[PDB]
C-alpha cells in the first residue's frame, strides 16, 4: 500500500534511542590518511550502512540472500551502499535539554504553556545561573513564594528545585493536563479583558498538547539525535582537504561539551564550574539547531561565517521545502538557440542530428541489438564513442527511433501551460532548433538568438499525457481568453491580404452603368485603344468585370499563368454556384482553405468572402473553423495558411524602399496653417487676453490638434492613393504596425513627456523619414529609457504577482460534476458610469470575458429565443444576449460561476466549466486552481510599474491594503448636506436621526452633491474602496464583486482580455477564512475554513443535535495571509519562517491528507490532478477477447 | 561533466504549467529519475537499456530526505493512509 | 526571415566572408596531499 497522509508526531527520548540504529556516543569522524570512519564516531559504518558494496569492512558473503550480515570483528551489516541515506544516530545526553523552537520561536511554545515569565525567566532558566523553584517544599523565606518561581543565585534560599533544563523537564511531567482546562474555563467568562487575553491563548497549545496524542515534556531533549553520513557528506574536494556539510563541524562541539562536562561529573564536583558548563551544553545544540539566534553566530576558528544549523538547513532558500519547486536538473534535458522551421509542418519540430541523439542514446542503443546490426548492448555503447563520424545504418535507426515520440520545449521565462509543447521532432542540419511558427506567440517566441529547452519523457505514460495535453496542435487556444493563438500573423497575413486586396484605378471615370454606356463590344475596345484601363470606377462594371468571363477557378488562375491580370483584379468568375465578382485572388483563399479544410463548400460558410483578409478576420475563421470541426483539421488549416501565405508573401515580392515612407502632401499646409495658430497666441499673450496658465495649455492642446491632423491624414491620403504601400497595407493588416507608430514614421512624431511628466510647448516637426534634429531628439529620448525602466523594472519581478497567486489555487480543481448548488450570480451587462452616472452596455469583449462558457441559472426569454436553464451558452450564444439588451429585454444575465460553487477543496464542474479553452465543457480533474493564477499574471508583464493602477494596484487588490485616501464609505442609508468652504470641510450622512459626521481633510474631490439619496456601503467620496471596512458593514460576496471587477478593470484599460471566472477563482480562498463567536468545540477565535464550519454546523443540530451552532462572521485575507493559515504545513512552510509552522503544528498532531498540489509535490507524489485524480486513473482496459479468459476464472 | 556534459535546470514555472496540464507523471517523472531519487536515475537508466516500461519509482528520494532532515531534528513525521494506519515509508 | 530571422547565401562561406577566429583557455593545478603529491608525467596506465 502507498502513502496518503503525513502526520508530524514530536520527537521521544526514547524513540530518539529507538531509531539512530547505532549510537554515535563517540568522537569525531573521518581519517583523510586511510578512507574510515573512527572506532565508533560520526561515520563508524557498523552502526549506519556499509560504505561501500555490500561488503563490510573486512570482506563476508556480499551474497544477495540469506537477511543478517555481519561478523566475528567486523559487524557492518552488508546491506548496499545506500541505507546510509536515513539511517541516524544518537548522541544520548548528559542531562538536560531544550529544542529553542518551544523556546525562541515566536510565542514561546514553554514559556507560555508554564507562563515562566513571558521570557527572561526561562532565559535565566538554565544560562546566567538563576534557580528555578520546582518542588515540594513548603515556599516562603524572607516572603511567601507562591508555587512558582526562581529565586535568585545569590538571593540565597537554596534550591529542592535546581536548574538547567532537568527543572523545565521534571516540571511540565508533573503538571496537571486537564485541570489547566478548568484553571482557564474559569478565568475565561469572568474575566477583566486585557490580559485575560493571552488566558485563552493557553489552552491553544494545552488543547493543542491534550486531544492530539503528543506528550510535553519530550520538549526538554534527553536524546540528541544524529543525522545520516549520506546526507550531511564528507566528500573529497581537490585531493586530501575535504569539504564537510557545514553541519557537521555543529554537531561537532556538541559531542566536544556532552563529554568535556560528562567528565566534570564524573569527578570533581565544583559546583560554580558544573554550572559554567552545561551553560554550553545547551548553546552548543542551540547552534546546531538554530545557531543564528539571540547575538552571537558560531565563530568556526578562522573566518566569520555563521555555518548553518538543522534551522536554516529546512529553511527554504532551497530547504528541502523550496528546493523541489525551484529547481532540480533532469536527466534527459538539453537546450539551445532556436530557428525557423518554415517547413515544418505544426506538431513537428526541430532537433539537429549531433544533440538529437546525445538526447536519445538509451533507446537507440537498444534498438540497435534489436536490429541484426551491434552485437551486444554494452558493445553498441563502443561504436557512437568512436569519437565522431557516424556510419549509415545508424541514423536510419535512430528515426525508425523516434518516429512516435515526442519532446517538450520551453522558452526562458516560460508562464503558461503553453510555454511548453511537445513535437514529433525531425532531424534537420545546422546545430540549432528549429521550431514551426505560430507557436512563437505563446512563449512570445521571439528571434535574436532567443533559445528554448527540450525534455524527453520516457513512462509510456508521461508521453502519453505530453501529446494528447500537450501538442501545440491539440492546444491552439489560450484558455487565458478562450481566443485563438495558433494564429497566423506578423507576415503569413501581409501575404494573405495582397492575395485578397483587390485594386482600384482611376484612368477612367464615366465607366459603368445600368444600361451598357453605347455597347460591350465598344466599351472594351475602348480598352485595347487606351483610356479606361480594367478595374475602375463604374456604376456597375470595369472593364475586366467583362474582358474576364472564367467559368472554373482553375481557369481565373490558369489565366494568372500567362500575364493577363494579376490576382488582385476584379473579374468575373462563376464560382460553386452562381456569378461572382471577386479576384482570382480572393477565390484562391477560399479554396486554399477550403481544400485543406475538406469541404470545398462549408468553407465558403465562415470565410469573409469579399474584403481584405486580415488578423482579426481569418482568427474568427480560424476559432470559427475549429467551432464546426475537429482540432486535426483546424490545424492543417492554420498549417497551409502558414504556407500559402508565405511563398505567397513573398512571390508578391513587396520591399521596403524609404520612399514608401509616404509623406502626404498636406504636411506643409498643416505644420503650415498651424505654424501660423502661434504667433497669434502668443501676439495675443503680448497684451493680456491670457494668463500664463490659459497660454500653455494653448500650444500644447494646439499641436496635439494638428499632430492628430498629421496623423489621420497622412493616413487619408494612404488609402485614396498608395493602397498598396508597404507600411500601411501592414498595420491595416495584421502583419506589423500599429495607428501610432507609422505616423512618427512618415508625418511626425509630436510632443514628448518630460523627465517628471510635463510637456514642452516645442513639438518635434520632422518625421523619421526626414532625419529629425540634434533637439528633438535629446527630448524624444526620455521615452524610450524612461519607457525602458517598465521593460526593467517590469521584468525583474519574476512572476512576483504569479507566485502568490500560485499558492492559493493550486487546490482549486475540477472535483466534481455539479457543486449541486442552486445559487448563482447575477451578470451585470450595463456600467453604472460612477461620474456621470448615465449609463452604457459594456464594450464588446468584457461581456465574452464575463459570459463566455458560463452557465445559465434560471433560464432567459428574449427576442423569441428560450436558453433554458443550464446550457454552456456559446461566444454565438452570448453574442446574442448581447443584441438582447441592446434591445433591452433583459438586465442581469444570471449564471452559475466559481465565485460561489460549493465543493469546497475544487470546483464543481458545471460551475466555471466549458472553456477548456478548447470550447468544451471542461473535463475533470483539471487544475484551474493553478490556471487562473497562470493565465492572470502572464499579462503582469505589459503592466505599467510606474506609481493608481496597473500591477501597483493589483498588489494593494487581491492582497487588499486600504489604499490612500480611504474613499470615505456611506455606512448606512439616508440623505445628506455638505458644510463651509475654504476652511474646515467634511460632509454628513444624516438618514432619520444619526448624523454620521463624515470629515475630509481639506483636500477632497466627492461627488454626491448636496441633497442626494442612498443604501448601504457605497463610494461617497471617490478615490478607492476599501476590502475590510466594507465587507464588514455590507458582506464578503459584496467585496467579491468589486475585488475582481475592480482588478479586471485596469487589466481592461491595457488590452488586457481573460474570461474573469479566473480572477473569480483566485478570489474565493480571499474568503476561505472566518473568525468565530459562541463555540461548540474549537477555540473562540482560531480562524477557519468555510467547509470545516458547516460539517461542523451542519452537523451539531443535525444527527449530533446539540452544543452550538458555532457561528462565525466575515474575514478576509490576501493571497499572502492567505496561504498561509492553510491547513496544511508541507505547504505552509514554504513561505515566511517555517519554525513556527512546524513548532506550533508538530505539537499538536497535525496531519494533511496530501489534497493539493505544493502538497504531494514537495513531495514528489502523483499529483491528484488530471492523470493523477480520483476519477480517470483506477480504471483497467479490456481486449475483447481477453475477457473470456478471466470470466472463466472468476467462476471457479 | 568529464566525458559526456551538461545538466539542464527545470523550475516552478515549468511544474505550475506543467501542473496546467494533467501531466502527473511527466511532472513525477521530471521529479524523480532525472534528478534526485538514486534508486531510479540508475533503476531507469537500466529499464532501457532493455526497454521496459522504466521507471515507476518506490516512492521519491526528496520525500524520505526530508522526513529524514525532521526526524533529524526532532519530530516523528509519521506516515497513514485512508484508515489512518501505521506506514512503512523506508523498509531499510 | 520570419519575425526576426535572416537568411544568408552559401557564397559568403564560399568567400569564406563571416568567420571568427577564437582561443580557448585550458588550465590546471596539481596539489599536495596527504595521500601523496599530484605530479604530471606523459605516462598514465591503460592509457594506449
Same mark, same amino acid.
Given at each position: 500500500k502507498?502513502?496518503?497522509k503525513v502526520r508530524?508526531?514530536?520527537?521521544?527520548?526514547?524513540?530518539?534511542?529507538?531509531w539512530?540504529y547505532g549510537?554515535?556516543?563517540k568522537?569525531?569522524?573521518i581519517n583523510?590518511?586511510?578512507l574510515?570512519?573512527?572506532?565508533?564516531?560520526?561515520?563508524?559504518?557498523?552502526?549506519?550502512?556499509?560504505?561501500?558494496?555490500?561488503?563490510?569492512?573486512?570482506?563476508?558473503?556480499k551474497?544477495?540472500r540469506?537477511?543478517?550480515?555481519?561478523?566475528?570483528?567486523?559487524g557492518?551489516?552488508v546491506?548496499?551502499?545506500i541505507?546510509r541515506r536515513?539511517?541516524?544516530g544518537?548522541?544520548?545526553?548528559? %542531562?538536560? *535539554?531544550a529544542?529553542?523552537?518551544?523556546?525562541?520561536?515566536?510565542?514561546?511554545?514553554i514559556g507560555?504553556?508554564?507562563?515562566?515569565?513571558?521570557?527572561?525567566?526561562?532565559?535565566?532558566?538554565?544560562?546566567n545561573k538563576?534557580?528555578?523553584?520546582?518542588?515540594k517544599?513548603? !515556599?516562603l523565606?524572607?516572603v511567601?513564594?507562591?508555587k512558582?518561581?526562581?529565586?535568585?543565585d545569590?538571593?540565597?534560599? +537554596?534550591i529542592?528545585?535546581?536548574?538547567?533544563?532537568e527543572?523545565?523537564?521534571?516540571?511540565?511531567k508533573?503538571?496537571?493536563?486537564?485541570?489547566?482546562?478548568?484553571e482557564?474555563?474559569?478565568?475565561?467568562?469572568?474575566?477583566?479583558?486585557?490580559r485575560r487575553?493571552?488566558?485563552?491563548?493557553?489552552?491553544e497549545?494545552?488543547?493543542?498538547?491534550?486531544?492530539?496524542?503528543?506528550?510535553?515534556?519530550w520538549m526538554?531533549?534527553?536524546?540528541?539525535?544524529?543525522?545520516?553520513?549520506?546526507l550531511?557528506?564528507?566528500?573529497?574536494?581537490?585531493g586530501?582537504?575535504?569539504?564537510?556539510?557545514?553541519l557537521?563541524?555543529l554537531?561537532?562541539?556538541?559531542?566536544?561539551?556532552?563529554?568535556?562536562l560528562?567528565?566534570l561529573l564524573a569527578?570533581?564536583?565544583?559546583?560554580?564550574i558544573i554550572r559554567?558548563?552545561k551553560?554550553?551544553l545547551?548553546e552548543?545544540?542551540?547552534?546546531?539547531?538554530?545557531?543564528?539566534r539571540?547575538?552571537?553566530?558560531?565563530?568556526?576558528p578562522?573566518?566569520?561565517?555563521?555555518l548553518?544549523?538543522?534551522?536554516?538547513?529546512?529553511?527554504?532558500?532551497?530547504?528541502?521545502?523550496?528546493?523541489?519547486?525551484?529547481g532540480?536538473?533532469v536527466?534527459?534535458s538539453?537546450?539551445?538557440v532556436?530557428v525557423v522551421?518554415?517547413?515544418?509542418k505544426?506538431?513537428?519540430?526541430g532537433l539537429?542530428?549531433?544533440?538529437?541523439?546525445e538526447?536519445?542514446?538509451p533507446?537507440?542503443?537498444?534498438k540497435?541489438? &534489436?536490429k *541484426?546490426f551491434?552485437?551486444?548492448?554494452?558493445?553498441?555503447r563502443?561504436?557512437?564513442?568512436?569519437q565522431r563520424?557516424?556510419?549509415?545504418?545508424?541514423?536510419?535507426?535512430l528515426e525508425e527511433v523516434?518516429h512516435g515520440?515526442?519532446?517538450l520545449l520551453?522558452?526562458?521565462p516560460?508562464?503558461?501551460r503553453?510555454?511548453?509543447q511537445?513535437?514529433q521532432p525531425?532531424?534537420?542540419?545546422g546545430?540549432?532548433?528549429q521550431?514551426?511558427?505560430?507557436?512563437?506567440?505563446?512563449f512570445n517566441?521571439?528571434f535574436?538568438?532567443?533559445?528554448?529547452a527540450?525534455?524527453?519523457?520516457?513512462?509510456s505514460? *508521461?508521453?502519453?499525457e505530453?501529446?494528447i495535453?500537450?501538442?501545440?496542435?491539440?492546444n491552439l487556444?489560450?484558455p487565458?481568453?478562450?481566443?485563438?493563438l495558433?494564429?497566423?500573423?506578423?507576415?503569413?497575413?501581409?501575404?494573405?491580404?495582397?492575395?485578397?486586396?483587390?485594386?482600384?484605378?482611376?484612368?477612367g471615370?464615366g465607366?459603368?452603368?445600368? $444600361?451598357?454606356e453605347?455597347?460591350?463590344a465598344?466599351y472594351?475596345? +475602348?480598352?485595347?485603344?487606351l483610356?479606361?484601363?480594367?478595374?475602375?470606377?463604374g456604376?456597375?462594371t470595369?472593364?475586366g468585370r467583362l474582358?474576364?468571363?472564367?467559368?472554373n477557378p482553375?481557369?481565373?488562375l490558369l489565366?494568372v499563368?500567362?500575364?493577363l491580370?494579376?490576382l488582385q483584379?476584379?473579374v468575373?468568375?462563376?464560382?460553386?454556384?452562381?456569378?461572382l465578382?471577386?479576384?482570382?485572388?480572393?477565390?484562391?483563399f477560399?479554396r486554399?482553405?477550403?481544400?485543406?479544410?475538406g469541404?470545398?463548400?462549408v468553407?465558403q460558410?465562415?470565410?469573409?468572402?469579399?474584403?481584405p483578409?486580415?488578423?482579426?478576420?481569418?482568427?474568427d475563421?480560424?476559432?470559427?473553423?475549429?467551432?464546426?470541426?475537429?482540432?486535426?483539421?483546424t490545424?492543417?488549416l492554420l498549417?497551409?495558411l502558414?504556407?500559402?501565405?508565405?511563398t505567397?508573401?513573398?512571390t508578391?515580392?513587396?520591399?521596403?524602399?524609404?520612399?514608401?515612407?509616404?509623406?502626404?502632401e498636406?504636411?506643409?499646409?498643416?505644420?503650415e496653417?498651424?505654424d501660423?495658430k502661434?504667433?497669434?497666441?502668443?501676439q495675443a499673450?503680448?497684451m493680456?487676453?491670457?494668463?500664463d496658465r490659459?497660454?500653455?495649455?494653448?500650444?500644447?492642446?494646439?499641436?496635439?490638434?494638428t %499632430?492628430?491632423?498629421?496623423?489621420q491624414?497622412?493616413?487619408?491620403?494612404?488609402?485614396?492613393?498608395?493602397?498598396?504601400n508597404?507600411l500601411?497595407?501592414m498595420?491595416?493588416?495584421?502583419?506589423?504596425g500599429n495607428?501610432?507608430?507609422?505616423?512618427?514614421l512618415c508625418?511626425?512624431?509630436?510632443?514628448?513627456?518630460?523627465?517628471?511628466g510635463?510637456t514642452?510647448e516645442?513639438p518635434?516637426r520632422?518625421?523619421?523619414?526626414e532625419?529629425?534634429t540634434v533637439?528633438?531628439?535629446?527630448?524624444?529620448?526620455?521615452?524610450a529609457?524612461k519607457?525602458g525602466?517598465d521593460?526593467?523594472?517590469?521584468?525583474?519581478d519574476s512572476?512576483?504577482? %504569479?507566485?502568490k497567486?500560485?499558492?492559493v489555487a493550486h487546490?482549486?480543481?475540477?472535483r466534481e460534476?455539479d457543486?449541486?448548488? %442552486?445559487n448563482?450570480?447575477s451578470?451585470?451587462l450595463?456600467?453604472?458610469?460612477?461620474v456621470?452616472?448615465?449609463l452604457?452596455?459594456?464594450?464588446r469583449?468584457?461581456?465574452?470575458?464575463?459570459?463566455?462558457?458560463?452557465?445559465?441559472?434560471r433560464e432567459?426569454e428574449a427576442? +423569441?429565443?428560450?436558453?433554458?436553464?443550464?446550457?454552456?451558452?456559446s461566444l454565438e450564444?452570448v453574442?446574442f444576449?448581447?443584441k438582447?439588451?441592446?434591445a433591452? &429585454?433583459?438586465?442581469?444575465?444570471?449564471?452559475?460561476?466559481?465565485?460561489?460553487?460549493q $465543493?469546497?477543496?475544487?470546483?464543481?464542474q458545471?460551475?466555471?466549466?466549458?472553456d477548456?479553452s478548447?470550447a468544451?465543457?471542461?473535463?475533470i480533474?483539471?487544475? !484551474?486552481?493553478?490556471?487562473?493564477?497562470?493565465?492572470?499574471g502572464?499579462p503582469?508583464?505589459?503592466l505599467?510599474?510606474r506609481?493608481?493602477q496597473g500591477?501597483p494596484?493589483?498588489?494593494?487588490?487581491?492582497?487588499?491594503?486600504?489604499?490612500?485616501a480611504?474613499?470615505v464609505?456611506s455606512?448606512?442609508d439616508?440623505?445628506?448636506?455638505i458644510?463651509?468652504?475654504?476652511?474646515?470641510l467634511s460632509?454628513?450622512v444624516?438618514?432619520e436621526?444619526?448624523?454620521?459626521e463624515?470629515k475630509?481633510?481639506?483636500?477632497?474631490?466627492?461627488?454626491?452633491?448636496?441633497?442626494?439619496?442612498?443604501?448601504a456601503?457605497?463610494?461617497?467620496?471617490?478615490?478607492a474602496?476599501?476590502?475590510?471596512?466594507l465587507? &464588514?458593514?455590507?458582506?464578503?460576496?459584496?467585496?467579491?464583486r468589486?475585488?475582481?471587477?475592480?482588478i479586471q478593470?485596469?487589466?481592461?484599460?491595457?488590452?488586457?482580455k481573460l474570461?474573469?471566472?479566473?480572477?473569480?477563482?483566485?478570489?474565493?480562498?480571499?474568503?476561505k477564512?472566518?473568525?468565530?463567536?459562541?463555540?461548540?468545540?474549537?477555540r473562540?477565535?482560531?480562524?477557519?475554513?468555510l467547509?470545516?464550519?458547516?460539517?461542523?454546523?451542519?452537523?451539531?443540530?443535525l444527527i449530533?443535535?446539540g452544543?452550538?451552532?458555532?457561528a462565525?462572521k466575515?474575514?478576509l485575507?490576501? !493571497?499572502?495571509?492567505? *496561504?498561509?493559515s $492553510?491547513?496544511?504545513?508541507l505547504?505552509?512552510?514554504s513561505?515566511?519562517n517555517?519554525?513556527?509552522v512546524?513548532?506550533e503544528?508538530?505539537?499538536?498532531?497535525k496531519?494533511?491528507?496530501?489534497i493539493?498540489?505544493?502538497e504531494?509535490?514537495i513531495?514528489?507524489r502523483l499529483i491528484?490532478?488530471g492523470?493523477?485524480?480520483?476519477?480517470?486513473?483506477?480504471?483497467?482496459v479490456?481486449?475483447?477477447?481477453?475477457?473470456?479468459?478471466?470470466?472463466e476464472?472468476?467462476?471457479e | 561533466?568529464?566525458?559526456?556534459?551538461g545538466?539542464?535546470?527545470?523550475?516552478?514555472?515549468?511544474?505550475?504549467?506543467?501542473e496546467?496540464?494533467?501531466?502527473?507523471?511527466?511532472?513525477?517523472?521530471?521529479?524523480?529519475?532525472k534528478?534526485?531519487?538514486?534508486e531510479?536515475?540508475?533503476?531507469?537508466?537500466?529499464?532501457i537499456?532493455?526497454?521496459e516500461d522504466?521507471?515507476?519509482?518506490s516512492?521519491?528520494?526528496?520525500?524520505?530526505?526530508?522526513?529524514?532532515?525532521?526526524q533529524?531534528?526532532?519530530?516523528?513525521?509519521?506516515t497513514?493512509?485512508?484508515?489512518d494506519?501505521?506506514?512503512?515509508?523506508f523498509?531499510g | 526571415n520570419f519575425?526576426d530571422?535572416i537568411?544568408?547565401?552559401?557564397?559568403?562561406?564560399?568567400?569564406?566572408?563571416?568567420?571568427?577566429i577564437?582561443?580557448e583557455?585550458?588550465?590546471?593545478?596539481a596539489?599536495?596531499?596527504?595521500?601523496?603529491?599530484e605530479?604530471i608525467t606523459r605516462?598514465?596506465?591503460?592509457?594506449?
Open positions: 502507498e502513502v496518503r508530524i508526531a514530536l520527537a521521544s527520548p526514547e524513540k530518539i534511542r529507538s539512530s549510537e554515535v556516543e568522537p569525531e569522524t583523510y590518511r586511510t574510515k570512519p573512527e572506532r565508533d564516531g560520526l561515520f563508524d559504518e557498523r552502526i549506519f550502512g556499509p560504505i561501500k558494496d555490500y561488503e563490510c569492512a573486512c570482506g563476508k558473503y551474497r544477495q540469506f537477511e543478517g550480515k555481519v561478523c566475528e570483528r567486523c557492518v551489516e546491506t548496499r551502499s541505507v536515513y539511517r541516524m544518537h548522541i544520548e545526553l548528559a %542531562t538536560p *535539554a529544542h529553542i523552537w518551544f523556546v525562541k520561536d515566536v510565542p514561546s511554545k507560555t504553556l508554564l507562563d515562566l515569565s513571558a521570557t527572561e525567566l526561562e532565559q535565566v532558566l538554565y544560562f538563576y534557580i528555578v523553584l520546582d518542588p517544599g513548603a !515556599v523565606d524572607g511567601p513564594v507562591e512558582r518561581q526562581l529565586l535568585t545569590e538571593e540565597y534560599g +537554596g529542592d528545585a535546581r536548574m538547567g533544563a527543572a523545565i523537564q521534571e516540571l511540565l508533573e503538571l496537571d493536563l486537564e485541570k489547566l482546562e478548568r482557564l474555563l474559569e478565568e475565561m467568562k469572568h474575566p477583566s479583558r486585557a487575553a493571552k488566558a485563552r491563548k493557553r489552552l497549545v494545552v488543547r493543542a498538547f491534550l486531544d492530539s496524542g503528543n506528550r510535553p515534556e526538554i531533549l534527553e536524546a540528541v539525535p544524529v543525522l545520516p553520513p549520506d550531511r557528506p564528507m566528500v573529497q574536494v581537490d586530501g582537504r575535504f569539504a564537510t556539510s557545514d557537521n563541524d554537531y561537532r562541539r556538541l559531542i566536544n561539551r556532552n563529554n568535556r560528562k567528565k569527578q570533581g564536583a565544583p559546583e560554580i559554567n558548563e551553560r554550553m545547551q552548543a545544540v542551540d547552534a546546531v539547531i538554530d545557531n543564528g539571540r547575538g552571537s553566530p558560531v565563530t568556526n578562522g573566518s566569520e561565517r555563521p548553518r544549523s538543522l534551522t536554516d538547513i529546512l529553511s527554504g532558500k532551497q530547504g528541502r521545502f523550496r528546493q523541489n519547486l525551484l532540480k536538473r536527466d534527459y538539453g537546450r539551445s532556436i522551421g518554415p517547413q515544418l505544426l506538431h513537428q519540430c539537429p542530428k549531433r544533440m538529437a541523439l538526447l536519445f542514446k533507446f537507440l542503443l537498444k540497435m541489438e &534489436e *541484426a551491434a552485437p551486444n548492448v554494452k558493445a553498441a563502443r561504436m557512437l564513442e568512436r563520424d557516424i556510419k549509415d545504418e545508424v541514423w536510419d535507426a523516434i515520440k515526442v519532446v520551453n522558452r526562458a516560460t508562464l503558461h503553453l510555454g511548453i511537445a513535437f525531425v532531424l534537420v542540419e546545430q540549432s532548433i521550431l514551426h511558427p505560430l507557436v512563437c506567440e505563446a517566441a521571439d535574436d538568438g532567443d533559445q528554448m527540450v525534455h524527453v519523457p520516457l513512462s505514460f *508521461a508521453q502519453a505530453a501529446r495535453q500537450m501538442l501545440s496542435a491539440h487556444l489560450s487565458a481568453s478562450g481566443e485563438p495558433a494564429k497566423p500573423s506578423r507576415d503569413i497575413i501581409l501575404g494573405l491580404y495582397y492575395i485578397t486586396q483587390v485594386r482600384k484605378e482611376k484612368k471615370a465607366m459603368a452603368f445600368a $444600361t451598357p453605347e455597347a460591350l465598344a472594351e475596345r +475602348g480598352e485595347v485603344a483610356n479606361a484601363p480594367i478595374v475602375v470606377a456604376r456597375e470595369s472593364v474582358k474576364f468571363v472564367f467559368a482553375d481557369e481565373a489565366a499563368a500567362h500575364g491580370l494579376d483584379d476584379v468575373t468568375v462563376r464560382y460553386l454556384g452562381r456569378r465578382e471577386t479576384s482570382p485572388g480572393r477565390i484562391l477560399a486554399i482553405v477550403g481544400e485543406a479544410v469541404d470545398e463548400k468553407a460558410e465562415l470565410i469573409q468572402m469579399d474584403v483578409q486580415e488578423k482579426n478576420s481569418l482568427k475563421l480560424v476559432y470559427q473553423a475549429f467551432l464546426r470541426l475537429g482540432m486535426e483539421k490545424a492543417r498549417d497551409a502558414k504556407y500559402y501565405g508565405f505567397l508573401s513573398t508578391s515580392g513587396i520591399t521596403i524602399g524609404i520612399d514608401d515612407a509616404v509623406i502626404p498636406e504636411k506643409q499646409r498643416y505644420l496653417e498651424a501660423r502661434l504667433r497669434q497666441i502668443e499673450y503680448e493680456g487676453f491670457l494668463t490659459e497660454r500653455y495649455d494653448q500650444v500644447i492642446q494646439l499641436w496635439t490638434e %499632430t492628430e491632423k498629421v496623423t491624414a497622412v493616413f487619408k491620403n494612404f488609402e485614396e492613393n498608395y493602397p498598396f508597404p500601411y497595407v498595420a491595416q493588416s495584421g502583419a506589423r495607428p501610432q507608430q507609422i505616423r512618427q508625418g511626425m512624431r509630436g510632443l514628448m513627456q518630460k523627465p517628471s510635463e514642452f516645442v518635434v520632422s518625421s523619421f523619414r532625419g529629425l533637439l528633438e531628439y535629446f527630448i524624444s529620448s526620455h521615452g529609457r519607457g525602466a521593460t526593467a523594472l517590469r521584468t525583474a512572476g512576483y504577482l %504569479t507566485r497567486l500560485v499558492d487546490e482549486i480543481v475540477v460534476a457543486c449541486g448548488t %442552486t448563482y450570480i451578470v451585470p450595463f456600467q453604472m458610469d460612477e456621470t452616472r448615465t452604457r452596455l459594456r464594450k469583449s468584457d461581456i465574452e470575458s464575463g459570459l463566455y462558457g458560463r452557465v445559465l441559472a432567459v427576442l +423569441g429565443r428560450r436558453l433554458e436553464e443550464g446550457r454552456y451558452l450564444d453574442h444576449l448581447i438582447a439588451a441592446e433591452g &429585454e433583459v438586465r442581469e444575465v444570471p449564471v452559475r460561476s466559481p465565485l460561489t460553487c $465543493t469546497r477543496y475544487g470546483v464543481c458545471k460551475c466555471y466549466g466549458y477548456l478548447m468544451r465543457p471542461v473535463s480533474g483539471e487544475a !484551474v486552481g493553478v490556471v487562473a493564477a497562470e493565465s492572470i502572464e503582469g508583464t505589459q505599467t510599474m506609481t493608481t500591477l494596484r493589483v498588489i494593494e487588490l487581491f492582497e487588499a491594503r486600504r489604499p490612500k480611504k474613499a464609505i455606512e448606512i439616508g440623505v445628506v448636506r458644510e463651509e468652504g475654504e476652511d474646515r460632509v454628513f444624516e438618514s436621526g444619526f448624523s454620521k463624515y475630509l481633510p481639506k483636500d477632497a474631490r466627492l461627488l454626491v452633491k448636496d441633497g442626494d439619496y442612498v443604501e456601503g457605497q463610494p461617497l467620496t471617490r478615490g474602496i476599501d476590502p475590510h471596512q465587507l &464588514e458593514a455590507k458582506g464578503p460576496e459584496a467585496v467579491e468589486y475585488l475582481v471587477d475592480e478593470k485596469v487589466y481592461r484599460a491595457q488590452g488586457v474570461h474573469d471566472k479566473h480572477i473569480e477563482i483566485v478570489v474565493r480562498q480571499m474568503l477564512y472566518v473568525e468565530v463567536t459562541d463555540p461548540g468545540d474549537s473562540l477565535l482560531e480562524g477557519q475554513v467547509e470545516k464550519w458547516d460539517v461542523e454546523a451542519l452537523n451539531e443540530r449530533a443535535e452544543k452550538v451552532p458555532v462565525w466575515p474575514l485575507m490576501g !493571497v499572502t495571509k492567505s *496561504a498561509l $492553510t491547513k496544511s504545513w505547504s505552509a512552510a513561505f515566511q517555517t519554525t513556527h512546524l513548532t503544528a508538530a505539537i499538536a498532531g496531519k494533511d491528507e496530501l493539493g498540489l505544493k504531494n509535490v513531495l514528489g491528484p490532478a492523470t493523477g485524480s480520483d476519477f480517470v486513473r483506477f480504471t483497467q479490456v481486449d475483447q477477447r481477453t475477457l473470456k479468459a478471466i470470466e476464472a472468476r467462476k | 561533466g568529464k566525458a559526456q556534459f545538466g539542464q535546470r527545470f523550475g516552478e514555472m515549468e511544474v505550475w504549467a506543467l496546467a496540464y494533467g501531466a502527473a507523471h511527466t511532472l513525477q517523472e521530471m521529479l524523480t529519475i534528478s534526485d531519487d538514486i531510479g536515475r540508475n533503476a531507469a537508466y537500466q529499464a537499456i532493455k526497454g522504466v521507471p515507476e519509482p516512492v521519491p528520494e526528496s520525500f524520505r530526505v526530508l522526513v529524514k532532515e525532521l533529524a531534528l526532532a519530530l516523528d513525521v509519521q497513514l493512509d485512508e484508515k494506519n501505521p506506514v512503512d515509508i523498509e | 519575425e530571422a537568411v544568408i547565401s552559401e557564397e559568403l562561406l564560399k568567400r569564406d566572408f563571416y568567420t571568427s577564437h582561443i583557455r585550458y588550465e590546471i593545478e596539489r599536495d596531499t596527504k595521500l601523496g603529491p605530479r605516462d598514465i596506465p591503460h592509457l594506449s
